Every structure is written in structure tokens, then in C-alpha cells.
Amino acid sequence: KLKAPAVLAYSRKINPTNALMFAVNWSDRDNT
DNA sequence: TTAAATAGGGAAGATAAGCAAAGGGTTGACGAAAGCCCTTTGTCCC
């Protein structure tokens, strides 16, 4: 009947990082 | 070197699988109540 095994797991295929926030101007975004 | 006046309510804490086998565990010493025989000492008889 093709029953699922007792232990079966999958890893994570999309890895984001922790975002960082900075304050800049709309016309001088070079320095943060 | 101050008097008072209070300090949040609600929800919720995951599941599955398994815990090993083999080998050995020491020795010696801790008796009373008589039987017989011999020796010695002492008493008594012949």
C-alpha cells in the first residue's frame, strides 16, 4: 500500500538572512 | 535631600526511531565430653 516510513524529513531549500535596517535620504543613499 | 499613585488583559507550547555483546567473584585459623593409658603428688591398707 506504500505506507510512509516512520521517520521522513526534508531540509530547507530557501535560506534568507536577518535583514538590516538603515536610515538614508532619497537622493543621498550612498552613506548609511 | 518630599508628600501620593498605579505597574494589562487574550491565545499556545510538535511528532517519529533506537539504549550492545563477552569474561571472571579465593583461600587458612577459632569443639565438648568423655573412653583408655602413662607419669607425678598425697592419703589408707597389706
Automatic annotation (TrEMBL):
Domain of life: Viruses
Protein name (Swiss-Prot/TrEMBL): Csy3
Protein source organism: Vibrio phage ICP1_2011_A
Full-length numbering of the shown residues: 3 to 34 of 306
